[PDB]
Amino acid sequence: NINDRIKQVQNERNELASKLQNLKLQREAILANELNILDNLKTFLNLIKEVKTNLNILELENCYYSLQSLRKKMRNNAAYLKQSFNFQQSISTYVDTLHLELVSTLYKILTNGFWKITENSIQFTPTVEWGKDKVHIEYDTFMDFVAQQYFPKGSLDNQAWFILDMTSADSQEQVRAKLNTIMKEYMNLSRIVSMIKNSIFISGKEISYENEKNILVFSKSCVSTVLTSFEAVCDFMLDGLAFRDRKTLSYELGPLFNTEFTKFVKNNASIILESLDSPLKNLVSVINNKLTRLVAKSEVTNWTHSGKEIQDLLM
């Protein structure tokens, strides 16, 4: 319908141009002014089309910047502000839906594309071919601009233009609710955090990592098994996650890992230390060093893992 609105203004402008030339005096100077307003209005309307097109072709980053510029013009654009209450009402309603469709689209791409989370499994895929046209999207690039545009410094910015510039209160809430769920599930990985917490170091809860498909699998299932399951989580974080997400999960789970791994080993030292050399003891050693590498790779500073305490225990 933007195309139709562009067409109506073009026809008004053309009929006015003809009316003016038909005249050819202070009645001429106002029609020429009126014409320039319609010309500027045309340009304004083309920006709304730009937003829609960028959403359509999945230039999602550009769409945001297109919208940002539009909302500034809705504030200050002389041609726009010369339009009627009825006109602006219809514009606002439509632009509100564009805010909503944009963020709804990001949620879909995240929920139905990059991540596949079920009752018993977490799969991550770092690229997607999205929609009817199978547009290639890379996760790193995608989430870089998403975090930048919508969640700078990691939280929902409720006083930022993207929410604040929304016209109607109900649409604004819809945009806010969607962005909140995105922040929770995809900036903070809340479902992933809970799943890992609820299964690690629990007897009879098994965890495996399928590295080729990139799936962390939780299933119904001894000391080695608890360890191989915790190691699957470590492998998933080291080798399976994007940089951003390894950092976030290491920040959130690190202190739990340090305390829960150390106590498990201490409490099961006798079996672990039964032989001089064993696969069991080897596995404990490998996990201990994987925790060291996880702290380093994730670049967090809220926990450390020298490996020292456990390296000493195995001696």
Q: Output the domain CATH number for residue 197.
A: 1.20.58.2230
- Whether 80 and 90 share a structural domain: no
Co-location of 89 and 30 in the same domain: no
Resolution in A: 1.9
How many structural domains compose the chain? 2
Q: For residues 46 and 70, give the distance between their C-alpha atoms in angstroms, rounded to a whole number.
A: 10
Determine the structural domain holding residue 160 and report its residue range.
85-315
Claim to verify: residue 242 and residue 123 sit in the same structural domain: yes
Instruction: Based on the fold, state whether residues 79 and 89 are members of the same structural domain.
Output: no
Looking up residue 79, the CATH number of its domain turns out to be: 1.10.287.3290
Sign of the C-alpha dihedral, residues 115, 176, 136, 94?
Answer: positive
On whether both 43 and 31 belong to a single domain, the answer is: yes
Both 203 and 246 in a single domain?
yes
Q: Residue 263 burial (CB < 10 Å; 0-12/13-18/19+)?
A: exposed
Task: Give yes or no: residues 78 and 119 share one domain.
Answer: no
84, 109, 141: which is the final residue of a domain?
Answer: 84
Among 84, 101, 124, the domain boundary falls at 84
Experimental technique for the deposited model? X-ray
> CA 33 to CA 79: how far, in whole Å?
11
Same domain? For 225 and 284 the reply is yes
Domain boundary among 84, 117, 149: 84
135, β-bridge pairs: 130
| 155/60 same-domain check | no
- What is the distance between the alpha carbons of residues 258 and 304, in angstroms, rounded to a whole number? 8
CA distance 281 to 130: 46
